[PDB]
């Protein structure tokens, strides 16, 4: 669920979530767009997790 994705991001990356928008790909996998709070910066979160 979007709630589970929200509370999963909040525990693994210690960042709160504005909203979660999900879709299901034709691959079969579920893609989640997770919007952060206005005070947290998504690319500075992405740097410490590895994607750049």
């Amino acid at each position: 669920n979007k709630h589970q994705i929200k509370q999963a991001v909040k525990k693994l990356y210690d960042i709160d979530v504005a909203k979660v928008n999900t879709l299901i790909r034709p691959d079969g996998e579920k893609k989640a767009y997770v919007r952060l709070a206005p005070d947290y910066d998504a690319l500075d979160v992405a740097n410490k997790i590895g994607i750049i």
Partner: protein, 50 residues
């Protein structure tokens, strides 16, 4: 149609993933007989049932 159900979309997802060619490194194997993928499917020719 665009008004799919979850099980139909998941079946289409699997049949999309099985429609790729064989990797190049499998026919360098010792006990190998496969030349290509003979179970391939084109959307115009074979209409997948359903």
């Amino acid at each position: 149609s665009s008004h799919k159900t979850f099980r139909i979309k998941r079946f289409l997802a699997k049949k999309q993933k099985q429609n790729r060619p064989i990797p190049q490194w499998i026919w360098m194997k010792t006990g190998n007989k496969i030349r290509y993928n003979s179970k391939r499917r084109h959307w115009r020719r074979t209409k997948l049932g359903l």
